[PDB]
Design a protein around this ligand. Structure first.
Ligand SMILES: [Mg+2]
Ligand SMILES: [Mg+2]
Ligand SMILES: [Mg+2]
Ligand SMILES: [Mg+2]
Ligand SMILES: [Mg+2]
Ligand SMILES: [Mg+2]
Ligand SMILES: [Mg+2]
Ligand SMILES: [Mg+2]
Lengths: 225, 93, 44
RNA sequence: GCCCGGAUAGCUCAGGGUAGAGCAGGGGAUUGAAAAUCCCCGUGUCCUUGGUUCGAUUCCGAGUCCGGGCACCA
RNA sequence: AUGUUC
RNA sequence: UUGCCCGGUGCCGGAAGGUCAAGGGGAGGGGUGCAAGCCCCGAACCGAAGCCCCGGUGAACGGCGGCGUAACUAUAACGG
RNA sequence: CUGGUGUUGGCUCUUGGUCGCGCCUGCGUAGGAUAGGUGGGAGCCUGUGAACCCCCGCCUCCGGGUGGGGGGGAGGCGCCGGUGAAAUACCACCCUGGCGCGGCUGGGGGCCUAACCCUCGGAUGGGGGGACAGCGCUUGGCGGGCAGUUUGACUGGGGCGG
RNA sequence: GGGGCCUGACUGCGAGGCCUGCAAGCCGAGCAGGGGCGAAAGCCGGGCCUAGUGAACCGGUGGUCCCGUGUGGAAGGGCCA
């Protein structure tokens, strides 16, 4: 029920022991034993009624040290914006007509942004939406400063958004950052959570929080440390 | 009826029925919707006990039940006889 | 629908009413407070 | 006032992406015909309100009208 | 299993 | 000989569910002391019968009121 | 009638409800088919024994999930592609609903005799019931069996209507 | 009827009156506080007017120069809303 390669990692964690945001940042890159540059995931179980849609931790956070990723941004805009965005960093732009090229079949982008005055984008959206890619105001991806947004996206500004279980998760780096550079990124994440606490919530906010990799085991940790 | 040791007897007590919400709470307050005479009896109970030859039994209040045993002991100094559990009884204090 | 107006942060009072479906969402209104004189006032 | 539940087509009712059987009308189909039987039609503010969401009749919170139980009404 | 008529 | 109707009411039964008292419980809060403390409020939640609910019951309370259709008419064994 | 409590004591048995804690668990259609939510994810497993037959165990929507194991002896799975609202390996955080040990709080039985209760040609005794019943205090319920009362005025009489 | 800034649908009062069995109801110049519109004169203490209402009691909430049962507090009242 588990990799020879994985069970060789169970030895290197203590279930019970709670770690510290650098014990874990040191410890993590030697739990990235899979044949590629693993991502370092942070996982908080939260103290919200996940049902009370208003106690809903949705946001984004700009991550210093970024994500180590390579996010290919599709934009959608008319007049002037178009290019203040073609450059600013985007890889496919613009500009209204490509929703037909969203026949679809065409999905070769990892994130999407748009200027408010396309509204009309959001209708046709059914294919873009449940994949979490449909430009929002809520988390991330709509504004008239579309370059200002394309930019920070590329310096790995992550969405995050609690789920129907009260849990929340985020990529916060690669197992190939210094540990000083995760550790910081981890701290930048909680700080975002902590400031998206629904004011109106019983119990301790971050009941649990863990750190882990794609393909690794987790580390029960102490936020603030 | 009556405790043979403690003298407790039934007493008259009204029973008050109230409706409403206390002023201590939401309020306006309580209105009495009926007050009725009734009696409260003591909790008399039978206590048989050995003493001397004869048995002897007491109608006594639950509260004072021990006091019966507390008598029986303190009547080991008395000179107790005659097929007269009657008399044994008045002889207890 | 009936309703108060409170000098900002605190007490005070004046009280009017709005028609809730039609334009209400938080009543904001410049008004004189007895206690310490002349202010905004939110609904309550 | 508090706690529960209900509100979906003309009526009677089923049910996070989508609105349905049933009855009555009308076409078909089956029979040599006729009944019985089978199939296909057209029907909604999904009580109202704000939320959550890319999407709400569905999830949330409020409100109205009903129903059940318990408070109580100056 | 049922399953009318001319 | 004593029909039809168990929806409502009553009685009989019923360990799905709703609600419901004292009491238990104390998340959390308060008054006062220099403090140990002493006094209160109080949220989950546990908490009977009852009522609601489910089934039965007529020599239990009761209820049995009202478009089309046959040799003309009328009526209607027959349907709704 | 009903909870609580006193009178009221001795032993058990096994039940809910809720929490640690472990195991499990997830099925509209379409679709390889049993798709719980959200991350992460391009790679994961494999002489630490693939495919493929078997059999053991739980779970089952009877299709298969899922744990192990024989035998076998080197490939399988995932990206891709179809379908779908949504993907599939692998990894993580998440009672979603069970089970199993346990804590903590209720419930219902059984057995006992010694309180209480009944009984025996009078009995310090024997028998039967038995901590129930009876009875005290308190809770809430049913309660025309009974009680005390209310049941407006105007009005071409009053009532009905208004 | 249309448009712009506003919030006087002010606080503190109120000469004088209409109405009137009481109680209620009604109109109100003017003064001060602080304000709005207007260049200014000035106007603004809701609505063209006359229906859209309910004494007291008992409670609830928000304030607050008040009382606080030997004393300090507290309980609980009062007063203003
Ligand atoms: Mg005692
Ligand atoms: Mg019946
Ligand atoms: Mg009673
Ligand atoms: Mg009478
Ligand atoms: Mg005057
Ligand atoms: Mg009075
Ligand atoms: Mg008062
Ligand atoms: Mg004093």
């Amino acid at each position: 029920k588990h990799g020879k390669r994985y069970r060789a990692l169970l030895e290197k964690v203590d279930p019970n022991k709670v770690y510290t945001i650098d014990e874990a940042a040191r410890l993590v890159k030697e739990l990235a034993t899979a044949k590629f540059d693993e991502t370092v995931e942070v996982h908080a179980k939260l103290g919200i009624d996940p049902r009370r849609s208003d106690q809903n931790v949705r946001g984004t956070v700009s991550l210093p040290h970024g994500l180590g990723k390579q996010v290919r941004v599709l934009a959608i805009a008319k007049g002037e914006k178009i290019k203040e965005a073609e450059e600013a960093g985007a890889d496919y732009v613009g500009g209204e007509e490509i929703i037909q090229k969203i026949l679809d079949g065409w999905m070769d982008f990892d994130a999407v942004v748009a200027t408010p005055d396309v509204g009309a984008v959001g209708s046709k959206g059914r294919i873009l939406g449940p994949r979490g890619l449909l430009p929002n105001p809520k988390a991330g991806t709509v504004g008239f400063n579309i370059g200002e947004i394309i930019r920070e996206i590329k310096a790995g500004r992550i969405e995050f958004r609690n789920d129907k279980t009260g849990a929340i998760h985020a990529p916060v780096g690669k197992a190939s950052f210094p540990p000083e550079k995760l550790a910081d990124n981890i701290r930048a994440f909680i700080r975002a959570l902590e400031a998206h606490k629904p004011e109106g919530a019983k119990g301790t906010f971050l009941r649990s929080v863990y750190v882990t990799t794609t393909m690794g085991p987790s580390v029960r940790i102490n936020p603030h440390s | 009826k009556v405790c043979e040791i403690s003298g407790k007897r039934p007493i008259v007590a009204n029973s008050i029925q109230r409706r409403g919400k206390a002023k201590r709470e939401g309020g306006v307050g309580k209105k009495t919707t009926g007050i009725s005479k009734r009696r409260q009896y003591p909790n008399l109970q039978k206590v048989r006990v050995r003493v001397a030859g004869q048995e002897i039994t007491f109608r006594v209040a639950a509260s004072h039940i021990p006091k019966v045993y507390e008598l029986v002991e303190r009547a080991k100094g008395l000179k107790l006889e005659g097929l007269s559990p009657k008399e044994i009884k008045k002889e207890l204090l | 629908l009936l309703l108060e107006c409170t000098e900002c942060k605190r007490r005070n009072y004046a009280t009017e009413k709005n028609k809730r479906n039609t334009p209400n969402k938080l009543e904001l209104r410049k008004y004189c407070p007895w206690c310490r004189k002349h202010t905004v006032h939110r609904e309550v």
